[PDB]
Ligand binder design. Structure first.
Ligand SMILES: N[C@H]1[C@@H](OP(=O)(O)O)O[C@H](CO[C@H]2O[C@H](CO[C@]3(C(=O)O)C[C@@H](O[C@]4(C(=O)O)C[C@@H](O)[C@@H](O)[C@@H]([C@H](O)CO)O4)[C@@H](O[C@H]4O[C@H]([C@@H](O)CO)[C@@H](O)[C@H](O[C@@H]5O[C@H]([C@H](O)CO)[C@@H](OP(=O)(O)O)[C@H](O[C@H]6O[C@H](CO[C@H]7O[C@H](CO)[C@H](O)[C@H](O)[C@H]7O)[C@@H](O)[C@H](O[C@H]7O[C@H](CO)[C@H](O)[C@H](O)[C@H]7O)[C@H]6O)[C@@H]5O)[C@@H]4O)[C@@H]([C@H](O)CO)O3)[C@@H](OP(=O)(O)O)[C@H](O)[C@H]2N)[C@@H](O)[C@@H]1O
Ligand SMILES: CCCCCCCCCCCCC(=O)O[C@@H](CCCCCCCCCCCC)CC(=O)O
Ligand SMILES: CCCCCCCCCCCCC(=O)O[C@@H](CCCCCCCCCCCC)CC(=O)O
Ligand SMILES: CCCCCCCCCCCCC(=O)CC(=O)O
Ligand code: NI
Length: 705
């Protein structure tokens, strides 16, 4: 089983995104989860976000039903500025502002999640958090697949996945994966549209050389809902004791949101001899996104709208059932070039087998932003009373808004040019002294940035030089158990400027982790467990003397326990489950402190199992079901209020189409939120809450020719 290819069973024993070298999970000093393509082919996830609903240490409701971005919170932390922190084939998909890219899960072979500091091999990064997806590569045997989806809210999807060789030797092979998806968003008025295709070409001149061309082109006319809803009407009852239905939409009838993505690159490797292997991963991308968006701020009585006139012009008791709103017109375009070159030296030193990795990583990202942001009273208010029982028979779109002619009073232009560059040199060794595998290594990064404000004519720049290393040990037993512990570090530059008109210094990550991994060589089952102590130092916090500007020195701690399990308990039984304990807390902070950051539940857990029949008349029938538990979380930094826990159930019914001459093909039915439970996924503040996803039914027919 290769770290860059299929896994056979839902259990992947190999992963290269933790050490940059194909290594069995048990031999990796860090918490690494691997969602197989098979698993994704089980719930037909809408996004890579979803494909992670069962993996521990990851929240996936930081936006509820919305799918605009695969923005994740890992171990209580996320990248600064609501930015993603997602990697594709070992090279980061560096985005900026509203320009973050997403890859459709159908084009993936596997989605992996690295928990904890990751700079020792990838450079600047949020603490305890990294996602790396592996593009599908040409297959060893021919593959001709056609897929058809049909579901709730007018879900219609058609896609293909073909892979064959040009020559009988396989020196030349290709793979073309594409799809077209259209659907109505949960919220009335909003649509979801996606067209994508991934051309891939592999050239193996011999059994020691592999150059694989990887491209992805995707166009999304409409990405759907991305607004905020007040805790008043969702988490908490509105004055009239009623609530906004889960399909409510407080955006302009003419709200639009699109994104365009284009990337070309390659993954290369060559084995020179018995001790040296070289591998280079390169990708270049140009992505765009534009939008006309009216989003909700909170209700007119929300501290946020204190300085709002339209609000102050309402009877003191009515300020609590009227919704304040703002808007934003955006248009961005960025280019991202990335290349990682690495030499793998394999040699010994008397019983000490070494696996030395030495390489340099480079990336440059440029993102030009030209947008307009409406401030207070920038857009009409909305009454929240009408949303009663007759809605709940629901939706009811609203009215257009003049995104054009931006009043210089209520709105202002925002035009910035962000540049980013990072160069890293890392050295790592994987020395195994029989049953005693010791991993250790470090990296030095040159993190340079520069931002131009096309209006203030300002140009902020900062060049960070940072070092990070990681050390760990794995006692590879033989019965399978692989106890381990490791120390890791990460660093994350700031783009914010202090009162002294200067970019702040980077924040850092320090994690202490110990755990045990069970990867028994016989049965196809993997069971990991770990407890950790992660620390983010020099976080930004409110200036002690309140000055609009922020001050550094802040600190946050996140300690918890994570256990996950995936297995093939039978030729017909599969199971996946995990539990997560997350204790995140502001160690040092001006305003908050002792408070837990919003959107990070203390408890999370999931369990899923499927059975398949080969027996009687029910031969070729798979039935599966599972549940995901999200504990309560805080809906704001002040911890003013709380978002209640919830549990959602998923079900699956699959039927092998062999009994009609079509072996390998099948028809399936997937249900998400079986009991159509209504829940607020989370809130990042009193005015920003997100309804969870309502029950969704999808019918899939996937044929293999
Ligand atoms: N490494 C890497 C990096 O480097 P670094 O340094 O960074 O590190 O990077 C790089 C880059 O590349 C990339 O990019 C691209 C794009 O780019 C662009 C384009 O578009 O192209 C450009 C840019 O800029 C620049 C740079 O580079 O930066 C600079 C300048 O100066 C120049 O040089 C340019 C070119 O070369 C030329 O063209 O480049 C940018 O842009 C923007 O910004 C800028 C600044 O700020 C920067 O800093 C400014 O300047 C500009 O401008 C403006 O524009 C506008 C438009 O429209 C757009 O929007 C306009 O306005 P209006 O009002 O008009 O509308 C304008 O424009 C126009 O005009 C002009 C002028 O005109 C006049 O004058 C002149 C004289 O002086 C002329 O000549 C005449 O006479 C008159 O008329 C012009 O110039 C323009 O253009 C033109 O050009 C040519 C000539 O030469 C021709 O003609 C053509 O046809 C045309 O076009 C016009 O248009 C104004 O001006 C702006 O604002 C960018 C942005 O940022 C975005 O991104 O852009 C890319 O491509 P694409 O396509 O894809 O995009 C690529 O890919 C990449 N790579 C690199 O190279 C390296 O490698
Ligand atoms: C099978 C399809 C392959 C398509 C290859 C070409 C893709 C072009 C995408 C362009 C997006 C970015 C662009 O606009 O601005 C780019 C310039 C184009 C760079 C293209 C580099 C790859 C070309 C070689 C491809 C080899 C394929 C075998 C940046 C600026 O300017
Ligand atoms: C055997 C293939 C070798 C490819 C060598 C590529 C070198 C790229 C240098 C890029 C310089 C900086 C860069 O960002 O320029 C960009 C614009 C050009 C992007 C070139 C993309 C090349 C894609 C190659 C695909 C290969 C498929 C086989 C600056 C702006 O924005
Ligand atoms: C395939 C051969 C090995 C990789 C060759 C490409 C290396 C590109 C490095 C670019 C650095 C400069 C770049 O930042 C300028 C702009 O843009
Ligand atoms: Ni340059």
């Amino acid at each position: 089983e290769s770290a860059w290819g299929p896994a056979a069973t839902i259990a992947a024993r190999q992963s290269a995104t933790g050490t940059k070298t194909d290594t069995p999970i048990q031999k990796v000093p860090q918490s690494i989860s691997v969602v197989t393509a098979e698993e994704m082919a089980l719930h037909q996830p809408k996004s890579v976000k979803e494909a992670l609903s069962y993996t521990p240490g990851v929240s996936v409701g930081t936006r509820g039903a919305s799918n605009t971005y695969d923005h994740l919170i890992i171990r209580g932390f996320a990248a600064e500025g609501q930015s993603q922190n997602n990697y594709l084939n070992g090279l980061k998909l560096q985005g900026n502002f509203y320009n973050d890219a997403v890859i459709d899960p159908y084009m993936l072979e596997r989605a992996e999640i690295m928990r904890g500091p990751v700079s020792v091999l990838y450079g600047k990064s949020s603490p305890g958090g990294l996602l790396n997806m592996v593009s599908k590569r040409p297959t060893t045997e021919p593959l001709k697949e056609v897929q058809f989806k049909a579901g709730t809210d007018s879900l219609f999807q058609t896609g293909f996945d073909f892979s064959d060789s040009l020559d009988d030797d396989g020196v030349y092979s290709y793979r073309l994966t594409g799809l077209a998806r259209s659907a109505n968003a949960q919220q009335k008025g909003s649509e979801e549209q996606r067209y994508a295709i991934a051309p891939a070409f592999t050239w193996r001149p011999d059994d020691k050389t592999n150059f694989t061309f990887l491209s992805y082109f995707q166009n999304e006319p409409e990405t759907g809902y991305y607004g905020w809803l007040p805790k008043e009407g969702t988490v908490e009852p509105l004055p009239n004791g009623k609530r906004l239905p889960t399909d409510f939409n407080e955006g302009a009838k003419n709200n639009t949101y699109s994104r365009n993505e284009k990337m070309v690159g390659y993954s290369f490797d060559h084995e020179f001899n018995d001790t040296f292997t070289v591998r280079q991963n390169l990708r270049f991308a140009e992505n765009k996104t534009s939008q006309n968006s009216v989003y909700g701020y909170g209700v007119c009585s929300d501290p946020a709208n204190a300085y709002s006139k339209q609000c102050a012009a309402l009877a003191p008791a009515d300020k609590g059932h009227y919704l304040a709103r703002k808007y934003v017109v955006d248009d961005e375009k960025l280019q991202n070039f990335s290349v990682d070159t690495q030499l793998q030296s394999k040699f010994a030193t008397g019983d000490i087998d070494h696996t030395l990795l030495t390489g340099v990583d480079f990336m440059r990202m440029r993102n030009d932003i030209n947008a307009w942001f409406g401030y207070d009273d920038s857009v009409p208010l909305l009454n929240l009373y009408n949303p009663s029982h007759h809605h709940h028979h629901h939706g009811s779109v609203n009215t257009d808004f003049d995104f054009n002619a931006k009043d210089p009073a209520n709105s202002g232009p925002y035009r910035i040019l962000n540049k980013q560059k990072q160069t890293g040199v890392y050295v790592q060794d994987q020395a195994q002294w029989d049953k005693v595998l010791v991993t250790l290594g470090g990296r030095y990064d040159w993190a340079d940035q520069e931002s131009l404000n096309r209006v203030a004519g300002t140009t902020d720049k900062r060049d960070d030089k940072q070092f990070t290393w990681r050390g760990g040990v794995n006692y590879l037993f033989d019965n399978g158990v692989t106890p381990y512990f490791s120390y890791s570090e990460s660093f994350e530059p700031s783009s914010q400027v202090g009162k002294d008109g200067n970019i702040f210094a980077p924040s850092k990550g320090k994690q202490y982790e110990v755990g045990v991994k069970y990867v028994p060589e016989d049965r196809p089952i993997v069971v990991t467990g770990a407890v950790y102590n992660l620390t983010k130092t020099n976080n930004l916090m409110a200036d002690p003397e309140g000055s609009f500007f922020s001050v550094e020195g802040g600190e946050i701690r996140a300690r918890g326990v994570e256990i996950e399990a995936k297995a093939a308990l039978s030729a017909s039984v599969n199971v996946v489950g995990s539990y997560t304990y997350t204790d995140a807390e502001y160690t040092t902070d001006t305003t908050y402190k002792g408070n837990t950051p919003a959107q990070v539940p203390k408890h999370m857990a999931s369990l899923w199992a499927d059975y398949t029949f080969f027996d009687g008349p029910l031969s070729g029938l798979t039935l599966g079901t599972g549940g995901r538990y999200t504990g309560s979380s805080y809906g704001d930094p002040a911890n003013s209020f709380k978002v209640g826990s919830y549990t959602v159930v998923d079900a699956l019914v699959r039927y092998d189409l062999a009994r009609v001459g079509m072996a390998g093909s099948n028809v399936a039915l997937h249900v998400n939120n079986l009991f159509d439970r209504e829940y607020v996924a989370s809130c990042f503040n009193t005015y920003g809450c997100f309804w969870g996803a309502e029950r969704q039914v999808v019918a899939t027919a996937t044929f293999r020719f």
